[PDB]
Design a protein around this ligand. Structure first.
Ligand code: SF4
Ligand code: SF4
Ligand code: SF4
Ligand code: SF4
Ligand SMILES: [Zn+2]
Lengths: 79, 190, 78
């Protein structure tokens, strides 16, 4: 239930934070999908986090490790 | 499709990787589909073990797959499957030094069966580029003659291969390849 | 002359976690470790969304693995 922050100023729209998030990958890549909500979607060229109320993230670091030009900061402390 | 992993289905019976369906099953299924829908043209068929000696046996094995179908359509056709470039499928023998023609056997089977129509792939004895949708044959040819080779795998669908080749007159292999198509055409009763 | 055994091998006890890896793999069955916890853990593989090897990365006792993909001509429809 952590909080992710995306630096819009250096986001290129690469979409490798959307493809690599394992909560996004739940809908289409799971047998009998449990939850179909998504943290990121690239609207107007930058990654927007729809997870406003910080309910779905799991601090996995797959998205921080994925962005090619580090731009996603993961906060492990309560918002 | 096994070429997409790097293998080839060298006979009519071996299964596809991860699919465990066989050339025989897929040919039969497509024939049933075609004659059920009543499409104008039949199942045009390439075949297996292309371009190797001794594959007239496999050519007969793949031609025996139509023995239980009848061409039903509102268009006039008596085929149920069309076996193409058969001078390529009518080789005989073990290798390229004990290599002769099986056109006699192939056309005996075709002269028997009336639901099988063919065409010849007569080689015109010149320089040419060979393009078939199957990878393994082109790769094998490249490893034989050490000339260019292009491969275009499609996604969830087919393969490809382009390789120049010299069908020159100064080779026993090319001479016999030329003779085979003429034997096929001149052994045709119909 | 008989036996050599130069030195000694023993387990730091405030760091070991009862994994049973060294006991299971010791050549002479000379290690005596008993797991602190008992129970069962199950993995419903059909619900993992693929590229999330967080469980593999964080398992202390490296019990978890990504089952190696089989080669072609060996997949056998599974
Ligand atoms: S930390 Fe994991 S769960 Fe959270 S947004 Fe990133 S990839 Fe998704
Ligand atoms: S991976 Fe990084 S650069 Fe690409 S869209 Fe996500 S935040 Fe932006
Ligand atoms: S292998 Fe197992 S028993 Fe041995 S030190 Fe490591 S955790 Fe402890
Ligand atoms: S950490 Fe492992 S079990 Fe959990 S979602 Fe990722 S792959 Fe599945
Ligand atoms: Zn062909």
């Amino acid at each position: 239930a952590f909080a992710v922050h995306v630096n819009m100023e250096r986001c290129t729209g690469c979409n490798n934070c959307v493809v690599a998030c394992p909560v996004n990958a739940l809908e289409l890549n799971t047998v009998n999908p449990s939850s179909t909500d998504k943290i990121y979607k690239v609207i107007n060229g930058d990654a927007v986090i729809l997870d406003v109320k910080h309910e779905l993230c799991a601090g996995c670091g797959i998205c921080v490790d994925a962005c090619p030009y580090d731009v996603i900061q993961l906060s492990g402390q309560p918002p | 499709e096994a070429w997409a992993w790097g293998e080839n289905c060298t006979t009519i019976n071996d299964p596809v990787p991860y699919f465990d369906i066989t050339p025989a099953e897929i040919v039969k299924g497509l024939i049933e589909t075609n004659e059920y829908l009543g499409l104008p043209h039949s199942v045009h068929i390439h075949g297996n073990n292309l371009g190797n000696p001794g594959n007239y046996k496999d050519t007969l094995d793949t031609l025996r797959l139509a023995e239980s179908y009848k061409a039903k359509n509102k268009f006039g056709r008596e085929q149920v499957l069309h076996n193409t470039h058969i001078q390529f499928h009518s080789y005989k023998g073990t290798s390229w030094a004990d290599f002769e023609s099986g056109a006699k056997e192939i056309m005996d089977y075709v002269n028997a069966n009336k639901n099988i129509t063919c065409d010849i792939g007569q080689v015109t004895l010149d320089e040419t580029t060979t393009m078939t949708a199957d990878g393994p044959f082109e790769y094998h040819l490249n490893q034989l003659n050490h000339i260019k080779w292009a491969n275009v795998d499609v996604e969830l669908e087919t393969g490809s291969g382009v390789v120049p080749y010299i069908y020159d007159k100064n080779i026993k292999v090319c001479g016999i390849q030329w003779a085979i198509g003429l034997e096929l055409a001149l052994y045709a009763k119909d | 002359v008989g036996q050599k055994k130069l030195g000694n091998v023993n387990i730091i006890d405030e760091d070991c976690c009862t994994c049973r890896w060294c006991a299971i793999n010791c050549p002479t069955e000379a290690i005596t470790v008993n797991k602190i916890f008992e129970g069962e853990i199950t993995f419903h593989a059909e619900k993992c969304p693929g590229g999330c090897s967080t469980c593999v990365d964080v398992c202390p006792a490296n019990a978890i693995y990504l089952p190696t993909p089989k080669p072609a001509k060996d997949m056998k429809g599974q």
